[model samples]
Target chain A: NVAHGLAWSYYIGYLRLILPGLQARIRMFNQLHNNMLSGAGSRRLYILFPLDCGVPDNLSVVDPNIRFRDMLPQNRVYSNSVYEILENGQPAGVCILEYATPLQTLFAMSQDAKAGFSREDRLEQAKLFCRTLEEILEDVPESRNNCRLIVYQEPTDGNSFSLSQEVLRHIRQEE
Target chain B: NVAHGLAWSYYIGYLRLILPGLQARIRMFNQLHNNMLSGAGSRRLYILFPLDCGVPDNLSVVDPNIRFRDMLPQQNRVYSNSVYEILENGQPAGVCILEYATPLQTLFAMSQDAKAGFSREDRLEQAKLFCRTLEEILEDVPESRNNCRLIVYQEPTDGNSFSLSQEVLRHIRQEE
Candidate 1:
């Protein structure tokens, strides 16, 4: 529960600092928790943050791919789980640092000009958010003990979105 | 291509024998040809068959799972590339024998009592369809739809649709 609190705090901070206009989209993410935490049976929590600001049009590809450690570019250090957000099948933004464990999860996004933020500025803010998230996970003993870090990368094909075998295995194992 | 003609013949036969009521659905499957056979680039053909006789209620799960041989019981043969068709989020039907090659594909289905046919009759008809399809492909020369690529199985979990790594790999390899 504390981990979920920290996750919400970071989520709010992301909206305030980065994509302020995406309140409705964030609400959808909030609503997802009701179904996931409804005590029906074992369920995994997935928090999808739109990389683009404002309402996502039909062109937006919100799906995520699983990222492996070696896939990370040498310059990118803070990112673990990364997804290339696509608009009409072209790369528009990225989602980073999807942390998942048996119980809690969290993630953040950086988008292009659609949200009125510059791509450069959004990425910089995303990196900072990731750094803060890392610190939060470390400083909060509950999160460190209860949550597992999950990361993803851009898929080779622009049209396809997929999770890695290891990530699927982990989710099923948790179930 | 000659293979396309044969594919159509078997397709017509399938409509005549099993689902004569599915004309509109058949047309949709026919339209899928525009994309797959467009020759613009490499692509895979996925055919979705509704289980009910007249119209499928929103309940059908149109997703397929990758089937492995070992998962089937010893008495059962002639199945691979199976998909669990879910009706209202529960297992209510199955799709079988999804043939795949670098360029061509096909698949069939079986449904519960919600359809006009009995479960036993549906399964029996599905097997007959599978058998006829196998013969048509075997009779035809190696072409778009004439590959020995039928796969499906009964759903164990009754609600989930999954594809195996091998199936995804095959699809990707076809691109190259």
Candidate 2:
């Protein structure tokens, strides 16, 4: 109950200071979380904040070989946890994962202008990204069933990849 | 790679045996996962699958911020992997998850009212609001006409024209 209070205040109250101009989202987040709490049974909530490790919208071709969904610059500890990853000035990407009988969905993952990362470095980052997500699957039971990780490409050049294979291969070797 | 290959085959190759008729979704899942696999970007995909839960379109009164039809529900989950905002007069409002057994009871008739802040009154308001949709379904569907269960608590008077069925009334009355 105490943890619930802290979480409530942190998101409902403190979130105002943390993220302004998103009052609409803030309201819904507070409402939905509160609704779930007021209700019954074991419901899990996840607020994910992914920052400057920005995933570009139209990812530039680095290596045609490394061609898959653009990799996050680093690995993120994915879970049904509440935490924020902060950088220099502001918060990164943040999302509210709410589960109910009639599941409604919303997401926000932000990225700034590119830093022009090299292909070699990008590859390394990709490996790390895949590894961290895979680790969650191994480390946290039911995570794979709860969520899926996919690197996405869009429309015409459509290609998508689930969390498995080459990127994972390197993660294992590096470990 | 080999395990990945077999995993692909298990679903991609032999899905027919494991689960008979999920072909189209299977194709989309394969395509998207393949697309994500083929390219490189941090561009992550969030999918939603809300079809299994309840009526996809029965809520004009709720004023859904996100449109459900164009929105593709994602893999492994019933609804898509996105947050939906429920709006009242173009402003965000809390949502209540209301569900019921088929055809008779009001849409969310069976839900344990948590009085979830705005939700308790919101849902009862919702029950009234959903009146027309329920009425229309009875009018529209062929089977519903034949199997029309006795409409209880129809609130036939102009204000709250919605009807409730036997099962839900049992709960509502028994509780009070």
Candidate 3:
């Protein structure tokens, strides 16, 4: 979950001009919410965005010339819904367009760097994150039961390249 | 989730008398519709009745003599809630009420009696059953999620009176 959040943040980091202030609020909210809800239950929830959304990653991957929308610190913002596949009455898999606010990514990266989560851990986290997004988009509330949350764990060293690389590889493998 | 459906059914079963059929349908439709929403990044949403607001179990324990408004067909109903703890978050834990429908219990008992679930393979079957329930509840659309389901398992033949007595004794000690 942390890796997915970080990846999302990386993509959204460059789009601050398009959706400013929202990231800061979301970051603060996520921090407090995580602390409060840590022991709530085994199940966790997540959100997802479409692949073609005007996110930074999509812009670079799909079209470099597309001038991104730069509307407001508070206006012309769009919400994205992720997708998960429920197979044979179970949450089998998920697909998501990684979209995280910069603060959320920074929070996640700090945790990842602190925890020193390896490549495999990053992959697993990304997988679960994608699955959660799918559940949200599919409206499969039951898939939320499969919602095993991936919280960002901080590592000792500040370097988060390993975590980033692992996440990038994980998404590429899925593609 | 099955437990939630059964409990809900039992709850509604009690209210059927007071609520016109159409009103009951509307109520149920609204209840389900409200339960399936996601806010922000799809955090796992839970809806639970508070003890003070009238959680079913609390009502039964607090006023044993008070009759349930919606009495089900059988007294053996079972009910369950995934978010029971959060609802009773700050309240005393054991004071909370959670159960599945009585009919569900009857079905299980029947399945056990019939040896529909192999006795020797209880553990493996239990895990499989749990997975199946999880999947069914998660993937099924709103309507299907509420529908009744039955999985027959073997009945325990042992008397187990010793354990039962021990539990009762423990409860007595706690009361003291």
Predict model 1's lDDT versus the native. Answer: 0.30
lDDT of 1 by residue, B12-49 (tens): 32322222222233334336433222221112223332
For residue B20, give model 2's deviation from the true position in Å: 21
lDDT of 3 by residue, B6-73 (tens): 23333333222222232233334336545322222111111222211121222221222211222111
Candidate 3 lDDT score relative to the true structure: 0.29
Candidate 3, A50-126: lDDT as tens digits: 22111232211122211222111111223322233333344433222223322222222223334533445434545
* DockQ per model, Cα: 0.01, 0.01, 0.01
Off by over 4 Å in 1: A1-8, A11-117, A155-161, A164-166, A169-175, B1-176
Q: Tell me the tens digit of each residue's lDDT in model 1 across A1-175.
A: 1122223344333322222222333334336533212211112223332222111121122234422221112100112233433344554333332432111111111221244234445334334434455565576553243333443433335854344333343344554
lDDT tens per residue, model 2, A4-39: 211222222222222333333334444755532211
Q: Candidate 3 docking: what grade?
A: incorrect
| Reference-based TM-score, model 1 | 0.21
True contacts kept of each: 0.00, 0.00, 0.00
